[PDB]
Design a protein around this ligand. Structure first.
Ligand code: DGD
Ligand code: CLA
Ligand code: CLA
Ligand code: CLA
Ligand code: CLA
Ligand code: CLA
Ligand code: LMG
Ligand code: BCR
Ligand code: BCR
Ligand code: BCR
Ligand code: BCR
Ligand code: SF4
Ligand code: SF4
Ligand code: SF4
Lengths: 42, 158, 68, 142, 73, 81
């Protein structure tokens, strides 16, 4: 079990999941704010 | 009106671009059933680009002589919703990332062969080091104050 | 009874030689040959491997600083 | 130096069909090489320049173009079948020269009697800059 | 014109980088600290110790001419 | 004399070059400047082909045997024709 944990902590899979989460966040932001060119908050 | 660039809340070529875009979209729309989900998504994108044109006509966007937005990064905070605030926001993010990475590495340096933890991250230590980003401006600050950020004549080895 | 040259053991050394990969580098003494016919009697291990894959070499005492 | 040469004789050749790896104009005008060894048993070995052939019993005699191929084959024969060997150089005048051992003992190990041709008693960093020696014949490593 | 001027500045800075690296690192870097004894243009310093293709300063000028042509184009 | 070989007193007398010399150039000689009491020597630089494999082996600080290049000849070029 702990072996599969140390394997999961190997940079490829960690990086893939991290990048997937980041891309999901970005595409969701783009969905909720289409075309988002300026900073119309301040 | 910087160098004569009128905002397309008032210019015309912007309206012409908007009109032609919605026109070609609508002409494409009338080749299906008025209820087909593809036609529905087409009308959705139509109103979406329409409200985009509207939003652009709400935030002082000085607008070119050809019907296109044009940023004004000259420093005047009047047009700052393009560079200054997003610039400092991204600088905050980048400082976050740089500081957290540097701190992780400085920490994990003290082991037997740090390469084994540089290829396979100490995800526990990584998790209890990562959220420190809120300190990256101030912390590094004190470092430079105490001179614990740079080195003088230690170059190779460590 | 004849005083053996070179540091004793474990003494981290700072390299003074210029034409080595570890110029201004921090290594560890592993032994020194007490023979006065040597010409490079100290030997130092490192934690950074050089281009040739080696991680150890020889020096005299003049090219050492017994840092601590 | 009690390390005399052996004055390479004319002994039979290995059994081989003859092929496009042999000698050329160079060997017939400038120089070539002959490697010679005694063999323990008729076996098979790959020649340097193509294919394989068999050796005979007793002393052998193989000819080749350049010294590198001869020495490569000799190292193969020393690491594969544990036999000693020599190789000689020939000149179109008729001269024969004895090259590799120069004492009989491999150059791999120490054997007093060899001079010190080409030493510098200083580490590599001590070499000097070409400006200090420009407009002369000397160079830094000399 | 702004974007093109920025691309031109890119070309300028990178070509300068190539040439200045060729100049300063000509005496020798930790890859070959005694390069200053090999003269200006030499093939290489052997395939071992990591491989040393295209390490002369002549080779630096070589690798810079490409970017020079690019920027002027 | 076509190419040139040099050897420096950082030689630890480990004898890898000679074992890797392709054309029988180098050898060892009795010295007093290491444990093995033996240092390199190049009395056969004529047949020095020029491949760096010799100094691609010397596991010293930077190097201890250098192969400086020079003019060319018929044998220093691996010519066989
Ligand atoms: C050449 C070399 C020189 C150097 C290089 C220079 C090259 C030029 C570089 C220029 C770069 C410019 C980039 C600008 C991007 C701005 C992004 C942005 O402003 O984004 C803002 C947009 C806003 O979208 C728009 O937001 C608008 C806001 O409307 C507002 O305005 C209305 C007006 O009627 C109302 O009055 C009301 O105020 C309000 O509804 C409309 O809703 C539009 O429909 C909608 O599209 O998205 C959002 O709001 C996202 C949610 C908020 C995120 C930020 C707050 C949270 C803090 C960070 C938390 C982590 C999240 C990180 C996210 C990072 C990415 C954002
Ligand atoms: C041949 C080129 C080469 C290669 C293959 C690598 C390879 C690597 N470098 Mg690297 N590097 C290079 C050249 C190279 N470097 C050069 C030229 C420099 C400049 C001198 C550096 C400077 C450098 C630094 C400063 C760091 C690396 C790091 C790394 C490692 C990244 C680990 C990873 O994927 O984390 C994946 C991590 C993530 C995707 C983010 C973490 C997400 C968290 C855990 C949340 C997940 C939920 C990896 C072994 C890093 C390292 O080993 O420590 C991290 C590091 O900090 N390198
Ligand atoms: C993994 C990335 C990710 C992230 C960060 C979010 C984040 C969010 N989703 Mg979401 N979602 C995701 C993947 C993701 N979703 C996937 C894979 C699907 C399946 C297609 C959905 C389907 C989905 C629906 C159907 C809805 C959300 C909604 C929302 C928002 C809730 C408020 C929030 C911002 C809600 C939303 O934005 O409505 C306002 C909503 O109704 N999500
Ligand atoms: C440093 C370069 C740079 C910068 C500053 C930007 C800046 C921006 N891009 Mg962008 N982009 C870039 C390179 C860049 N891009 C590259 C290289 C690509 C190709 C992969 C894209 C492809 C792209 C798309 C497809 C979209 C953006 C969008 C955006 C806007 C952000 C909207 C949001 O949700 O946040 C913002 C103006 C969004 C937008 O509305 O554009 C204005 C959007 O949907 N970008
Ligand atoms: C020397 C180059 C330079 C520098 C360092 C800055 C830097 C800055 N400008 Mg600036 N600016 C520049 C050129 C420059 N700008 C040019 C060429 C113009 C047009 C002539 C302007 C017009 C301008 C305006 C109109 C304003 C700034 C402002 C600012 C500050 C916000 C920031 C420090 C703002 C400022 O003073 O602070 C609010 C501001 O209102 N700038
Ligand atoms: C947090 C780690 C970190 C930090 C603080 C820095 C800091 C710096 N780098 Mg750098 N670098 C890094 C990682 C890092 N680097 C990695 C991993 C690589 C290999 C891809 C490089 C490759 C690199 C080059 C080639 C150059 C620099 C340069 C510089 C300097 C100027 C900034 C710049 O141009 O960066 C530009 C930005 C990048 C190159 C992006 C790299 C940042 C990576 C993506 C972050 C890595 C985070 C980590 C691996 C993920 C784990 C997260 C955590 C959970 C552990 C600055 C000192 C420049 C220099 O010499 O300045 C004088 C330069 O020329 N860096
Ligand atoms: C925070 C999550 C955590 O602490 O996990 C801790 C665990 C275990 O963490 C691992 O433990 C190993 C020994 O079992 C080694 O110590 C590794 O270095 C370490 O990364 O990390 C994971 O396995 C999950 C990685 C992916 C996380 C995202 C899941 C969705
Ligand atoms: C196996 C393996 C590997 C690989 C991996 C990979 C290959 C990965 C990939 C990954 C990926 C490639 C991922 C992706 C993802 C994607 C995503 C995640 C997407 C999403 C999307 C979304 C979410 C959308 C949504 C929506 C819709 C649907 C509609 C409505 C609206 C919206 C837009 C919201 C490695 C190398 C590590 C190692 C070995 C093992
Ligand atoms: C199944 C499988 C397969 C296939 C695979 C594939 C094909 C995959 C693909 C994949 C893919 C295809 C992926 C992709 C991805 C992508 C992405 C995910 C993207 C993202 C993007 C983003 C995120 C962006 C962002 C941004 C930027 C960066 C700029 C600024 C702004 C924005 C936001 C726009 C095969 C058979 C071969 C094999 C077996 C398995
Ligand atoms: C969303 C958004 C945002 C944000 C963004 C961000 C935050 C981003 C990040 C990004 C990132 C995070 C990026 C990164 C990148 C990195 C890279 C890109 C790298 C690269 C590398 C390379 C390229 C390499 C190089 C080299 C080497 C190292 C080797 C030698 C040679 C050479 C130099 C080639 C903002 C607010 C602003 C706006 C709106 C949109
Ligand atoms: C705003 C702006 C402007 C201005 C600009 C300027 C004026 C700039 C300058 C800049 C400069 C003049 C810079 C300098 C710098 C220096 C130095 C010296 C730096 C340093 C850095 C550092 C120190 C960092 C560090 C760190 C951190 C903190 C984080 C990451 C990691 C590390 C550790 C790396 C204009 C209007 C024009 C345009 C728009 C924008
Ligand atoms: S290619 Fe690289 S390795 Fe092959 S010779 Fe030229 S330099 Fe030496
Ligand atoms: S060049 Fe280097 S390798 Fe080739 S023979 Fe002369 S010494 Fe041995
Ligand atoms: S150079 Fe390396 S191999 Fe040649 S003699 Fe000195 S130590 Fe032995």
């Amino acid at each position: 079990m702990r072996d599969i944990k140390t394997y999961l902590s190997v940079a490829p899979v960690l990086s893939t999941l991290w990048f997937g989460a980041l891309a999901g966040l970005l595409i969701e932001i783009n969905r909720l704010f289409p075309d988002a060119l300026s900073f119309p908050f301040f | 009106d910087i160098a004569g660039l009128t905002p397309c809340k008032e210019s015309k070529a912007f309206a012409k671009r908007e009109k032609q875009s919605v026109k070609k979209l609508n002409s494409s729309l009338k080749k299906y059933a008025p209820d087909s989900a593809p036609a529905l998504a087409i009308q959705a994108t139509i109103d979406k680009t329409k409200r985009r044109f509207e939003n652009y006509g709400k935030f002082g966007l000085l607008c070119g002589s050809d019907g296109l937005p044009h940023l004004i990064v000259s420093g005047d905070q009047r047009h700052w919703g393009e560079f200054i605030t997003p610039g400092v926001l991204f600088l905050y993010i980048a400082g976050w990332i740089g500081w957290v990475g540097r701190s992780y590495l400085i920490a994990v340096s003290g082991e037997k062969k740090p390469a084994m933890r540089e290829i396979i991250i100490d995800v526990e230590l990584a998790a209890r080091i990562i959220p420190r980003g809120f300190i990256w401006p101030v912390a590094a600050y004190r470092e430079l104050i105490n001179g614990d950020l740079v080195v003088d004549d230690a170059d190779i080895g460590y | 009874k004849p005083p053996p040259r070179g540091p004793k053991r474990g003494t981290k050394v700072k390299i003074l030689r210029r034409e080595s990969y570890w110029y201004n580098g921090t290594g560890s003494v592993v032994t020194v040959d007490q023979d006065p016919n040597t010409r490079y009697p100290v030997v130092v291990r490192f934690a950074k491997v050089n281009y040739a894959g080696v991680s150890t070499n020889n020096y005299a005492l003049d090219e050492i600083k017994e840092v601590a | 130096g009690f390390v005399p040469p052996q004055l390479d004789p004319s002994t039979p050749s290995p059994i081989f069909g003859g092929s496009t790896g042999g000698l050329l104009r160079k060997a017939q005008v400038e120089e070539f090489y002959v490697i010679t060894w005694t063999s323990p048993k008729e076996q098979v070995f790959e020649m340097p320049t193509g294919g394989a052939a068999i050796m005979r019993e007793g002393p052998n005699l193989l000819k080749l173009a350049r010294k590198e191929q001869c020495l490569a084959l000799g190292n193969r024969l020393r690491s594969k079948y544990k036999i000693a060997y020599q190789f000689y150089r020939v000149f179109p005048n008729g001269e024969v020269q004895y090259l590799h051992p120069k004492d009989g003992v491999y150059p791999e190990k120490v054997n007093a009697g060899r001079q010190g041709v080409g030493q510098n008693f200083r580490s590599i960093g001590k070499n000097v800059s070409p400006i200090e020696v420009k407009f002369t014949g000397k160079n830094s490593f000399d | 014109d702004f974007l093109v001027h920025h691309a031109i500045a890119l070309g300028l800075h990178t070509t300068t980088l190539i040439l200045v690296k060729g100049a300063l690192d000509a005496r020798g870097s930790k890859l070959m600290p005694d390069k200053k004894d090999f003269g200006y243009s030499f093939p290489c310093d052997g395939p071992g110790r990591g491989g040393t293709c295209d390490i002369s300063a002549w080779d630096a000028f070589y690798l810079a001419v490409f970017w020079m042509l690019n920027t002027i184009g | 004399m076509s190419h040139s070989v040099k050897i420096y007193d950082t030689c630890i007398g480990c004898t890898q070059c000679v074992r890797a010399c392709p054309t029988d150039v180098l050898e060892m000689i009795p010295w007093d400047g290491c444990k093995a009491k033996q240092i390199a020597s190049a009395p056969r630089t004529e047949d020095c082909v020029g491949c760096k494999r010799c100094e691609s082996a010397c596991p010293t600080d930077f190097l201890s045997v250098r192969v400086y290049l020079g003019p060319e000849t018929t044998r220093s070029m691996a010519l066989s024709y």
